[PDB]
């Protein structure tokens, strides 16, 4: 065959980014996390987005024989099983058949978190059970609000940087799109003196200590280090080490020049 079927357009509800906490036991929360770790939409989330998402999942109790969802019945909800047994049933022409079952674990409806998706199956509880549910509108907002926040500003980190002060708005956003994040535990070596200068760093949280073959700098939230990588490709003059648990933004200088050209060029404008 059916190569002549057109691909339909899809579209979620508008939300312009420019509170909900459903309590759960620690164990429920661990199992919920573990069930979502390989699901496309969850697996790349940072710890803070994941945590808000789990916060927002609501409890759904079901009695034996209850329909958790019905075939063709709108997909605005994703579900993870907390406990209970369930039968999976599909009606096709035709004919209604039991196609499988869940035993105290499983999840379904993830496509609903992207756009409206009528369920392809009817799922029925075959014992008392419970599930964690999540809307699409609730999920979207959490993700979009959080990312819009990590931008605008992530920069203002970026724009407080002396070397980057002559960046235009659009060019700064290109850097915001891709700037990476790294986490370190107390006493990890972030930068080693004498090593290739591959990138620069901005401290998001925690404290970084700069030392040289001798303490020459202490770096707190909003401060950059390794920034000489932008203007010279000489070996690192200093080492850097995490004081406490440290989270840094990290930008590779090659990637930076692919997007924008040499930094000195931006610094010799007006």
């Amino acid at each position: 065959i059916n190569r002549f079927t057109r691909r339909a357009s899809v579209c979620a509800e508008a939300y312009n980014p420019d509170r909900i906490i459903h309590p759960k036991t620690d164990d429920q929360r661990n199992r919920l996390q573990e069930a979502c770790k390989d699901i496309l939409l969850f697996k790349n989330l940072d710890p803070e987005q994941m945590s808000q998402v789990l916060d927002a999942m609501f409890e759904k109790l079901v009695k034996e024989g209850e329909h958790v969802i019905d075939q063709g019945d709108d997909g605005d909800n994703f579900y993870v099983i907390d406990r209970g047994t369930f039968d999976i049933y599909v009606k096709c022409d035709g004919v209604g058949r039991c196609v499988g079952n869940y035993d105290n674990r499983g999840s379904f409806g993830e496509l609903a978190l992207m756009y409206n998706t009528p369920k392809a199956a009817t799922i029925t509880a075959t014992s008392p059970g419970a599930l964690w549910g999540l809307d699409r509108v609730t999920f979207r907002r959490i993700i979009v609000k959080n990312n819009a926040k990590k931008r605008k500003m992530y920069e203002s980190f970026i724009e407080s940087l002396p070397f980057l002060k002559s960046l235009e708005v659009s060019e700064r956003l290109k850097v915001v799109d891709v700037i990476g994040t790294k986490v370190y535990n107390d006493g990890e070596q972030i930068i080693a003196q004498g090593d290739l200068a591959d990138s620069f760093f901005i401290v998001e949280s925690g404290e970084v200590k700069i030392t040289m073959k001798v303490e020459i700098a202490r770096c707190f939230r909003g401060q950059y280090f390794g920034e000489l990588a932008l203007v010279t490709n000489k070996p690192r003059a200093a080492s850097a080490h995490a004081i406490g648990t440290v989270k840094c933004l990290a930008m590779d200088v090659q990637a930076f020049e692919r997007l924008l050209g040499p930094c000195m060029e931006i610094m010799k404008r007006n």
């Binding site: 691909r7 579209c11 979620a12 509800e13 508008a14 496509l111 931008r151 290109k174 997007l259």
Partner: protein
């Protein structure tokens, strides 16, 4: 000169963008002839101008349905963009108007049919054939992007073939003016960029990704990311891992690895040299960019068309009436239209 040309398109666009057209025709001036297309949102109707005898493709949107889907601005974007842009490969808006039930947009009729139909019938296009079409999109995106417009729905279904075998890009439902970053998950599953799927916020780079999907689909006859379940297609897109057919040329493959790049620090269209990385790329060595723009090049394929108003290049749909309620609906939601 491309600079001085684009500096000027911009001048012209901003002037029309500032003050938009409204109610430049009405339903009773047209005869409905035949449904040309339907989709996730409204449809398209061959119509005949009662007086001039001219044929047009009239897009119809039901206000209540748009409201329910929360598609209101998309509809206002589409109309407001279409009346302000002007480029050889963009289908022109002739008239727009509304009534108690519907919004209407009357475009020029392009009789050659969707590239989808032709592509599916032949199987796939030879590289020079696919290259002819790609060059038009490249130039259309350059034009749209210089105005801060993104298109967001590139696919063969949305490209119409005209009487000369040139492309007319058609449905601007998802088009939008973005100066910063935008967030709506929309498009067509096979054509979605990673950043749309994962809600990272995004601008121009998604169109260049989609150009890579399109080119790949023209030369191969099927899109690079496909599967049983949509969620599975997304997984592949986000891995961004792609297999090429043994018949793809090395230059084609090199271009598609640069377009279908998950990493934005490496995606063609998004780097320091912008669109020139694509224009100067070698798969495009034999492309005369000014000549394509002037439609002086010779099309690899001319559609067969009999008389005006002939619809043989289009599929046949269930014909449903255009219903106009005696009660005005959602009048305020659409006051700007």
């Amino acid at each position: 000169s491309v600079k001085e040309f684009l500096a000027k398109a911009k001048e012209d666009f901003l002037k029309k963008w500032e003050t938009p057209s409204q109610n430049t025709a009405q339903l009773d001036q047209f005869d409905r002839i035949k449904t040309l297309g339907t989709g996730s949102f409204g449809r398209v109707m061959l119509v005949k101008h009662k007086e001039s005898g001219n044929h047009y493709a009239m897009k119809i949107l039901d206000k209540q349905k748009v409201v329910k889907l929360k598609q209101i601005e998309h509809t206002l974007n589409e109309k407001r963009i279409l009346q302000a842009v002007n480029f050889p490969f963009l289908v022109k808006l002739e008239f727009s108007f509304k009534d108690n039930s519907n919004l209407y947009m009357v475009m020029e009729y392009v009789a050659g049919g969707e590239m989808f139909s032709h592509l599916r019938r032949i199987g796939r296009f030879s590289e020079p054939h696919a290259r002819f079409y790609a060059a038009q999109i490249v130039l259309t995106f350059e034009y749209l992007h210089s105005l801060d417009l993104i298109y967001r729905d590139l696919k063969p279904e949305n490209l119409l073939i005209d009487q000369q075998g040139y492309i007319q890009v058609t449905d601007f439902g998802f088009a939008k003016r973005v100066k910063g970053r935008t967030w709506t998950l929309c498009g067509t599953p096979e054509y979605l960029a990673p950043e749309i799927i994962l809600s990272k916020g995004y601008n121009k780079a998604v169109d260049w990704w989609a150009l890579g999907v399109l080119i790949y689909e023209m030369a191969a006859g099927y899109p690079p990311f496909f599967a049983d379940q949509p969620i599975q297609i997304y997984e592949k897109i986000v891995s961004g891992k792609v297999r090429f057919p043994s018949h793809f040329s090395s230059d084609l493959k090199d271009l598609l690895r640069n377009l279908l790049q998950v990493d934005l620090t490496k995606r063609f269209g998004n780097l320091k040299n912008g669109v020139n990385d694509i224009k100067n790329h070698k798969w495009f060595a034999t492309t005369d960019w000014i000549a394509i723009y002037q439609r002086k090049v010779e099309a690899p394929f001319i559609p067969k068309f009999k008389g005006p108003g002939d619809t043989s290049n289009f599929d046949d749909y269930e014909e449903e009436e255009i219903r106009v309620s005696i009660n005005e609906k959602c009048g305020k939601e659409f006051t700007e239209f």
